[PDB]
Assembly symmetry: D3
Homo-oligomer: 249 residues x 6
């Protein structure tokens, strides 16, 4: 494999234009350690410039998507350093989870095969589209660990899940399954685990057929237009269209 | 008819306070040409001052609502002119599609009888309310034509359709039927085509019974309140209420 | 009872950490008079500092939650005074309905036992969570009384109910039942009236188990994050997390 | 001349690529009546498509720039008609004063020769740049007439004049001269009335030296970027740059 | 007098429609304790409904306007009680300093006679207009005490003082005098202390000449319009005008 | 020295807790090439974790601060590669110029010794504070090169320079000197070039006297509070204060 052995906590496999990105700490339910965060920044920067990768799928090894932030590894790394290390460690989490990922140049799909807890909600929603297994379990367990949702988790909910349901799951920390995730709008679809890869693959190959520059303008302009008024968007959306026409040539 | 023969690409029929506005280029699936855009600006300005029109219904001739922007006619008109003509042609599209229509002084209803593609999404969502036929087909085909959604189409989606579904339909360009449109929140209701006119008419006549000044304050204040904080809205919404009381007298 | 006889238009009963707050003008369907507004400001300020109250439930006496603003009492009080009294009376309505309530230090639940009309929508949505009876009837009757929705009612809808449904109910003034309220996202759940208290109580006791400072950061940070960009929220949400850690100690 | 006798309340002189637009009701201090608003919409739409006009200068006939709204002619039109006529009249005022003018495709300069009161503040600030005479007199007289500022007047102030000075002039309705207008940022520069036209003409000719599509992207993108965050602007301002490159 | 001995930390003198509100802990530089915050909420609510008060002037007893938060009395109240007492104490500070004061129904003027430090910046900017003595001394001393500015102090700066100057005074904690306050836009004007009261009184009497409902719409609409786009403001500012017409 | 020969286009001198960062392509007026952008990302990340650097000063070698983008080296890299290389190149420019720099954990000062054109405006304004020489010359030359300002240049102007002056300098591309930069608020102060370094050093040492965590909360909270309403800021600015107290 082009990327075999390159990262310790992540695996990347290219197949016919699809970059399958697997969070790969299965014994730790792919908990996002500071090492995983630095490696995932490198994965996204590398795949952005890899002409053979037209779409990214973000999935988890084993029975986990990600259980969220790795408590042990964060604090061993923070407590060993001055205050300023926490600022860098948070930036590294943000950098892959949404600063590069949410407005990524290439289309992105979360393939949620299992556990998706806490911090995993940020990259889940930064990913453009999402398919889960029926068998997947989700939760915002932060409240039961004595922290409010950290990083962009609460905004990830605010963008995808209705006000009342967002507050219910944030406030109670109750778990929910793949069907509920799809019903609430957190993902596009929930399917049996045995059909997850094929469902994700057909969507990925659909996106691969689109003009990349046009798809980028369309998906990323939509995300930004949510934040702008109609008068502001007249200007912004026509600028993205004209920008698309320049960069396609 | 009061408005018979007045416009070449649009028909207007008044019935008991209802202004039935028909996009009328059926052989071209009511594609929005620059002529249609200029005529629809004139229709909205004329009907605003017509005391006999209390509610507007926007519908399409034949099996089409609108197939979106008329490619042929736009480019024949643009390429024949200097750069500055494109700015005017875009303003004319915006002017009827949402600058006058979204915060129109009178209540508006889209009666979606058939095809609704691409550019049609802007006036669809500018219209206050919408009823479609089950038999209607919708799509954001722009991505498959090699352009991101132009004008206010992506914002029209952002205001009515959940994040994940909006991105799915923008990114894939997949079509969806009237039932899906209603399920996603793009329209208020989907009914059999044979019940579309009657369903629309009963809603229109309901709106006609309301105090016009109060209905205007209520519908347009709602659309603006979405953009404002709660503290800002305390001020704005009480100002709209007091404004209503002045202008009703 | 600790609070027996203390307020003329409201009753408060503490049970094992639950502050049951009952709007108590049943013969007037708990219409919100200026007296009720001043008393409810005092209830919220008092309960904020009552160590024995960990969660608030807002409910209505009799077959009513609240029928909305008390027309008779508002105008008897306004017309008897100079212009400046209307500014004070509106501030008092806002103060309890959402300025204290929406970002209240303690978790809040609306227990909607019956009629919820017009002005009641503001505290309904300021409350974090909401359970209604199937038997409850809701409506935005303002349009049929010749006023647009006053105070924060239209924003309360904008935050919880989809664009098309919000406009339909604001523009038509049509009533809807508890099941529809839950379907549209106005409340978290609709249950038979005979199960309303128990459903509300189990949710309240769930919230009581959480660390109060953490629950406050989580629920109130979510409401504020809706208003902020992702870049702004990186800063704000980590500040709320760090603030939580300081104030928990 | 090209536009002679075309409009009853406005004069247009085109020379060397400069469209000199003169508000032309001198005996009424160029008060903005509903007729002047409709004619000014037509003027801006006409000049936008005039390939021989590269820059617009907005000025007043006589000792006035504009005294603001023509109360008499506004109330004659509104009180005549149904409630809904006021919606159209307000929209016509907004249409020329800033909906077309603030983000106009061509560079715009206000040349403030004299009185500039109330409603005149909206097009004053919609204009990209502004030079006034020292002899010009400004005021937000609305408060003394018993109305708060209408249309976009208060926002025109908020965009150009500091919070304290804006509130002082809105609340007191006191007048200020050209030098004070320049000191507060309401205009680029205050010069003697004797030098106003020549100073304005030199600026207009400088702007005509620029690539029109590029100048449009630069000026109108600046106005919009004020409303957007840095992260939003990374996207928006690169999109305007790439749009310029396509349209040039 | 009408309000004699009513409040322990504040004095109110009413004359000729002017409510002179004096922060009254001179020996403690009028430091804002929790008691002064609760009394100031009561003062503003009381004066709002006082038909004989048309304009408020906020000033300080002695050589101080306000030194800012009373650290000693704040920490005595908070450290005594549960965590939740701090929420109430912060809310009381906000309630008078800007939640009631910034968009107060009556015109407001800060009359800055002396020291104005830290927390005093919030009500300073909430007040519509402000005149200071040249002899007044200002500072954001928070940085030298080991806290960033609390409550709305940093936003008070952001609304009135340029980015660079705000950051310089926040980051360094250096003091500045009345002339520098006026130069930066923190106040309308700096005048000699000998002329401060008479200058303030003349301004207050000018504001009393205005229609109170119209003045309220004009001043408070201006503050809000800063937050809204031009398109939003077309709707909002016409709604405030029509609201004025109804309420007048 | 600690950072000798580490970067090809940048020099870092650490002394007395001050990291003097010199853009170091003097013969090319310190033009910002893609290599300088990548090295400047590394410089800021390196210095953030350097416990011996408490304050950063950004300056230029030779008679330039920075002439702005290196057109030649940018177009050599982009035109070589696929479309997607331009995304990475723009991101690298943004990364050091403001994504790391505007809300940097340590206090930052721009020390503008000479030419500051076009793209240089982004890091100029990202820097917390700025002092220039009187002899420094500024310009937004983009318009004369046929591009609107790219990256965050127009927003840098919008945050620091009044609407009218911003538009004048963007639309005309005319140059201005150090005194005009200070007058417009683009910088804190303009001093003679002979006194620039010593003035900058005294400011840097003042900032080093502050609690670093508190200073970070104060400066970066101020920049953010500009974007938020008063009600939003009551929440945000108290959260930054409580966050400071935890992290100190």
């Amino acid at each position: 494999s082009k990327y075999e052995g390159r990262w310790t906590t992540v695996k990347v496999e290219l197949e016919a234009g699809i970059a399958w990105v697997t969070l790969n700490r299965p014994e730790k339910r792919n908990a996002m350690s500071p090492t995983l965060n630095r490696e995932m920044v490198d994965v996204l920067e590398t795949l952005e410039q890899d002409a053979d990768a037209g779409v990214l799928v973000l999935t988890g090894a084993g029975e986990s998507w990600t259980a969220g932030m790795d408590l042990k590894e964060y604090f061993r790394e923070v407590d060993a350093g001055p205050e300023i290390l926490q600022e860098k460690i948070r930036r590294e989490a943000s950098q892959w989870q949404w600063k590069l990922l949410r407005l990524y140049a290439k289309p992105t799909i979360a393939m949620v095969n299992g556990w998706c807890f806490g911090g995993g909600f940020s990259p889940l929603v930064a990913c453009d589209l999402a398919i889960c297994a029926n068998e997947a379990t989700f939760g915002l367990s932060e409240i039961n660990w004595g922290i409010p949702p950290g990083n962009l988790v609460s905004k990830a909910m605010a963008d995808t899940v209705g006000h009342r349901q967002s507050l219910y799951y944030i406030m109670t920390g109750k778990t929910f399954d793949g069907r509920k995730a799809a019903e609430m709008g957190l993902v596009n679809d929930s399917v049996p685990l045995a059909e997850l890869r094929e469902t994700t693959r057909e969507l990925a190959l659909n996106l691969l057929e689109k003009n990349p520059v046009v798809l980028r303008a369309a998906k990323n302009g939509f995300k930004r237009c949510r934040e702008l008024t109609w008068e502001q968007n007249e200007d912004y959306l026509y600028a993205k269209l004209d920008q698309s026409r320049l960069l396609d040539t």
